[PDB]
Design a protein around this ligand. Structure first.
Ligand SMILES: Nc1ncnc2c1ncn2[C@@H]1O[C@H](COP(=O)(O)O)[C@@H](O)[C@H]1O
Ligand SMILES: Nc1ncnc2c1ncn2[C@@H]1O[C@H](COP(=O)(O)O)[C@@H](O)[C@H]1O
Lengths: 130, 130
């Protein structure tokens, strides 16, 4: 196996579908473990007169992550929902998890180009229908 | 096969060796045809009092291209030695030849980042020992 651990980064756009079945086949053909990441991305002040729905908001993010994770057969131990700047957190989890190929979509300043610039491992940029 | 035609771009540096055996294995594992490209890169005035060795110069470039092409079993019909700007010519041959994955090394303004920005196909950036 040329690569043993692929991290797929998904932004939950319409575009993801292309990369999902492609990455599923790639991982199989080269014999790599898949992990999955989605980054959650008076501005520090919290509204006092309205009810918050942060738990419903997060659950929606979890369900989209799980739709894809289930399709790819990725154990929930290797699915990542993190908050932060996409480029930073994608590279952080890649390094933390011993990933050797990061897969990102590409249509700035873009996420693909930023991950390329800082990645300590190989990067696959799947050209998306922008 | 997720990809049917991989174009490997080589700059003839010490760094190429990493990408060559990696790309050889990748192409085999995913079942893709390999092509290979190296770009040749009073400034328009030609010296009159010295003998030129442009043919020896080109032959050296051909031998380095052929060392790699022979290793990868690439038919000389699919090896490319072109003059121009690397990013432009790499994308030009990719498009001309119906390539679906371009492989480049990555350590600006870099070639990897430029090919990413203009590529109409997927791009693999192999992280080099800079
Ligand atoms: N919040 C995010 N979580 C995970 N991946 C992302 C995120 N935003 C962007 N990406 C990656 O970057 C690609 C294109 O994003 P962008 O350049 O931000 O439009 C997406 O297909 C993902 O691969
Ligand atoms: N003259 C060239 N011909 C083919 N590929 C090149 C050339 N220059 C740069 N590259 C590609 O870009 C990578 C890094 O180049 P650079 O960013 O120019 O240092 C190399 O490993 C090649 O993949």
């Amino acid at each position: 196996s040329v690569y043993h651990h692929i991290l797929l980064a998904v932004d939950f756009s319409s575009e993801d579908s292309q990369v999902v079945q492609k990455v599923r086949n790639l991982a199989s053909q080269i014999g790599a473990r898949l992990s999955l990441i989605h980054v959650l991305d008076y501005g520090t002040a919290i509204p006092l007169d309205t009810e918050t729905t942060y738990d419903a908001m997060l659950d929606v993010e979890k369900q989209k992550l799980s739709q894809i994770g289930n399709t790819l057969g990725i154990d929930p131990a290797h699915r990542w929902l993190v908050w932060g700047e996409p480029r930073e957190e994608i590279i952080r989890i890649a390094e933390q998890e011993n990933v050797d190929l990061i897969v990102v979509g590409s249509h700035l300043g873009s996420t693909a180009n930023s991950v390329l610039h800082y990645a300590k491992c190989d990067v696959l940029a799947v050209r998306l229908r922008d």
